[PDB]
Design a protein around this ligand. Structure first.
Ligand SMILES: CCNCc1cn(CC(=O)Nc2sc3c(c2C(N)=O)CCCC3)nc1C(F)(F)F
Ligand SMILES: N[C@@H](CCC(=O)O)C(=O)O
Ligand SMILES: N[C@@H](CCC(=O)O)C(=O)O
Lengths: 261, 261
């Protein structure tokens, strides 16, 4: 019998953002963004009621090599704290084994963010020099991509990054963006193209995406392995895609939100 | 107990192509291309033996509105003639209901092919004029996209296309490409970006992709609903993606095959 779905998500612009007057608001009304709108459309199309909740540790999901314990939104699904994750959650082999993922609702690749005027055009450029530091988010698919890569240029990037001092790794996207902005061109941030493209068009308009994408992948809606929600959630994603709704929401939250001309 | 997998596919460059000396060859050796190489890697990674076979009717898959019968590669899976489809087979809602699809191994969008010098930059351009004819492949996801679209510009394109005389629809990609080349700029062909991008770089180098993509989707490996092959095939796709193998094969069959500079 039908009950209220607990949705795990993460504060990540423009996907889930606190409204500025959130202290004045209750429940799902506290939040706005692409994944908030998507949650509403999916809920509507699968006939369910839901509660948005921000993941407590503020992480996406990785497994600890010692304890084998999952953190982040992945751990919330794995250990039964949440029924579904609606977020910019990257589809990976390691995750697909422990949770179910819908077909992708958005595509992306790993990309490079620089302070405007930084003399770097590509990951090759980054790997061949030392003056400009570079790093990635902690507990995410981007860090794992570099850690497990056996491709020469990325292997070389990873060997640098893992022992660089001070740490090149950051805990949130906001913190990586802040570091690019405040490091006067001496730090480049490796992040997903979708996030990069949003920030590029936000004030103070001082960052830039450079070079091709390093890989090719997608975000999926994630459910615990074998949940009854998996099948209808997947069909809702395909239907919304085909109805043009996913493209409408991308325009709403990227193009319409552009503050840089 | 483990037996030889029947793989359904379609002749579509650069995915599956007859080797020029195919009369001299037997079995899987008759064929080359991206999907031939992918079939070999997936077979290797799931521990199975396989037989490549070209779909008899030469179609992708649509359901007849009268009889409700599926044709093409989709029908081969649905009616049990094949065990798996390894091809440029687009993930759609209607198909996902009757077959299982792996996560996407390649991304694409609907795009516009013109003879070089054709005064058309976009689907809006196409929809606002009459001198230049335009159409799509029969029995495919592109025709259905336009047929079912309620988006103004594509609705308008579809109303034209469905009653245009002579027919704007073609039976194979080769035939749509031939029509662009031989119609002196008076026909534009609507096809998937991946196919477009390949042809653009092939002699006689007289076509061109123009405008943004009309939509966003992917190709998946397809199995009959509930096949034991679904789960290991999906994990092989993610692993190959992550190992960089899918990117290596894209370069092999697109960039390395470029004859246009
Ligand atoms: C129904 C919404 N359609 C969006 C969509 C976008 N794609 C393609 C895509 O997002 N690309 C992905 S995602 C991804 C991979 C790849 C790839 N190699 O191209 C490899 C590893 C696993 C995750 N496909 C679709 C859709 F949903 F039709 F299938
Ligand atoms: N979307 C990523 C987080 C961002 C990143 O790693 O760059 C994940 O699911 O882990
Ligand atoms: N890949 C398409 C065929 C090509 C097209 O429709 O443009 C399909 O699966 O139907």
């Amino acid at each position: 019998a039908n009950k209220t779905v607990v949705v795990t998500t993460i504060l990540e612009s423009p996907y889930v953002m606190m409204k500025k007057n959130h202290e004045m608001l209750e429940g799902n009304e506290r939040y706005e963004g692409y994944c908030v709108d998507l949650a509403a459309e999916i809920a509507k199309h699968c006939g369910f009621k839901y509660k948005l909740t921000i993941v407590g540790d503020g992480k996406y999901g990785a497994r600890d090599a010692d304890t084998k314990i999952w953190n982040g939104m992945v751990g919330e699904l794995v250990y039964g704290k949440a029924d579904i994750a609606i977020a910019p959650l990257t589809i990976t082999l390691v995750r697909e084994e422990v949770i179910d993922f819908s077909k992708p609702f958005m595509s992306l690749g790993i990309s490079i963010m620089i302070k405007k005027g930084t003399p770097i055009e590509s990951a090759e450029d980054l790997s061949k020099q030392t003056e400009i530091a570079y790093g990635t988010l902690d507990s995410g698919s981007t860090k794992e991509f570099f850690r497990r890569s056996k491709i020469a240029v990325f292997d070389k990037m990873w060997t640098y990054m893992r022992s660089a001092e001070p740490s090149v790794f950051v805990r949130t996207t906001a913190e990586g963006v802040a570091r690019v902005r405040k490091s006067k061109g001496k730090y480049a941030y490796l992040l997903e193209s979708t996030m990069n493209e949003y920030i590029e068009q936000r004030k103070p308009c001082d960052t830039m995406k450079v070079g091709g994408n390093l890989d090719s992948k997608g975000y999926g809606i994630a459910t615990p392995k074998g949940s009854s929600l998996g099948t209808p959630v997947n069909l809702a994603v395909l239907k919304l895609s085909e109805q043009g709704v996913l493209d409408k929401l991308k325009n709403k939250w990227w193009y319409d939100k552009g503050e840089c001309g």
